[PDB]
Scaffold this active site. Structure first.
Site, PDB file in Angstrom:
ATOM      1  N   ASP A  35       0.546 -10.316  -3.152  1.00 22.52           N
ATOM      2  CA  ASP A  35       1.757  -9.657  -2.638  1.00 22.52           C
ATOM      3  C   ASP A  35       2.443  -8.888  -3.767  1.00 22.52           C
ATOM      4  OD1 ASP A  35       3.955  -8.851  -1.649  1.00 22.52           O
ATOM      5  OD2 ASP A  35       5.046 -10.697  -1.783  1.00 22.52           O
ATOM      6  N   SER A 199       6.838   9.376  -3.065  1.00 23.75           N
ATOM      7  CA  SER A 199       5.943  10.254  -2.310  1.00 23.75           C
ATOM      8  C   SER A 199       6.485  11.653  -2.166  1.00 23.75           C
ATOM      9  CB  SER A 199       5.755   9.654  -0.912  1.00 23.75           C
ATOM     10  OG  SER A 199       4.691  10.356  -0.241  1.00 23.75           O
TER      11      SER A 199
END
Lengths: 330, 7
Positions: A35, A199
């Site tokens: 994780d 992004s």
């Protein structure tokens, strides 16, 4: 040194991936969720309240010759899940895929949340965010990556998650037969202690790439792709039959549908999610309505490039002193 | 469905 280890989804949906980890001496093998959104390696154990363990393989530390109590140290953790967990904290030998680290903090659950008890397939979690998010106190404990680093051939790990299929976590090297074309690297901020990147835009099916900065985290810990409300609304726009469902809690569309892909930018590069990735699966059993795998981050408060976006890709977690995120198509 | 959200 390096390590490789296979990682296998825990159901037909790809809800979560487990990877076996070897703890102690002789080895106990546990299947932990890697994780990258958290920094705690905890395990169900001989200390966990009995009424709260349903199927999971526990770490027993008394059977480990290598184990040692870290006296003082406690740890407490909650997830976005509202999932939670606490215990005390041993140091022990941990191996992933034949990369061994000694004196890894291994945080042994006295209690667990019902979500975890119910989840017979995950024995514990292995945390892969920056150590600044470790919950042990009074003194924080370094992640297995951070421990590993001094011995790796390169200070990296890579996540090649599978679409309904196994895949692989690599520590210490980049496997150039694993992806296609080149890796594009983008800049990481550890201000919040996450693999947090920006992004560069996005396009829905065949349509224009819109240029618009999406800061999010790379979290192998989350299932779906959580993006800002207007971007999710834009994408779901090209799927008739789709709508938002306060009943079921997000965008749902007819199973028979044919979702457009989803393109997210990484620097000057582009990564394509197939539609088929974005079909999470029917919302309950036998339904003709499926749940969507793009969802609105707006309630969470942070954009999350979960497992549905990561499994379209070969991702490289580069942890040199100025850490970066590598993404290649595969 | 059964999403997961690891902090």
């Amino acid at each position: 040194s390096t390590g490789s280890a296979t990682t296998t989804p825990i159901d037909s949906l790809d809800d979560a991936y487990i990877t076996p980890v070897q703890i102690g001496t002789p080895a106990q093998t546990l299947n932990l969720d890697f994780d990258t959104g958290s920094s705690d390696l905890w395990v169900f154990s001989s200390e966990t309240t009995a009424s709260e363990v349903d199927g999971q393989t526990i770490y027993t530390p008394s059977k480990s010759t290598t184990a040692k109590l870290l006296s003082g140290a406690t740890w407490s953790i909650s997830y976005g899940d509202g999932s939670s967990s606490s215990g005390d904290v041993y140091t022990d030998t941990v191996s992933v895929g034949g990369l061994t680290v000694t004196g890894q903090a291994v945080e042994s659950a006295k209690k667990v949340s019902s979500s975890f008890t119910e989840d017979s397939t995950i024995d514990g979690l292995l945390g892969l965010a920056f150590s600044t998010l470790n919950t042990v106190s009074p003194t924080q404990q370094k992640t297995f990556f951070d421990n590993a680093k001094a011995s790796l051939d390169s200070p990296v790990f890579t996540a090649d998650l599978g679409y309904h299929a196994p895949g692989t976590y690599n520590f210490g090297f980049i496997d150039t037969t694993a992806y296609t074309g080149s890796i594009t690297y983008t800049a990481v901020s550890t201000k919040q202690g996450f693999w947090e990147w920006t992004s560069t835009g996005y396009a829905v099916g065949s349509g224009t790439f819109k240029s618009t900065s999406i800061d999010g985290i790379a979290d192998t810990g989350t299932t779906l792709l959580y993006l800002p409300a207007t971007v999710v609304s834009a994408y779901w726009a090209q799927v008739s039959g789709a709508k938002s469902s306060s009943s079921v809690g997000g965008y749902v569309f007819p199973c028979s549908a044919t979702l457009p892909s989803f393109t997210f930018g990484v620097g000057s590069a582009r990564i394509v999610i197939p539609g088929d990735y974005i079909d999470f699966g029917p919302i309950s059993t036998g339904s003709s309505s499926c749940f969507g795998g793009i969802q609105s981050s707006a309630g969470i408060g942070i954009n999350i490039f979960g497992d549905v976006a990561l499994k379209a890709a070969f991702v490289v977690f580069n942890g040199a002193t100025t850490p970066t995120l590598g993404f290649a198509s595969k | 469905x059964h999403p997961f959200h690891x902090l």
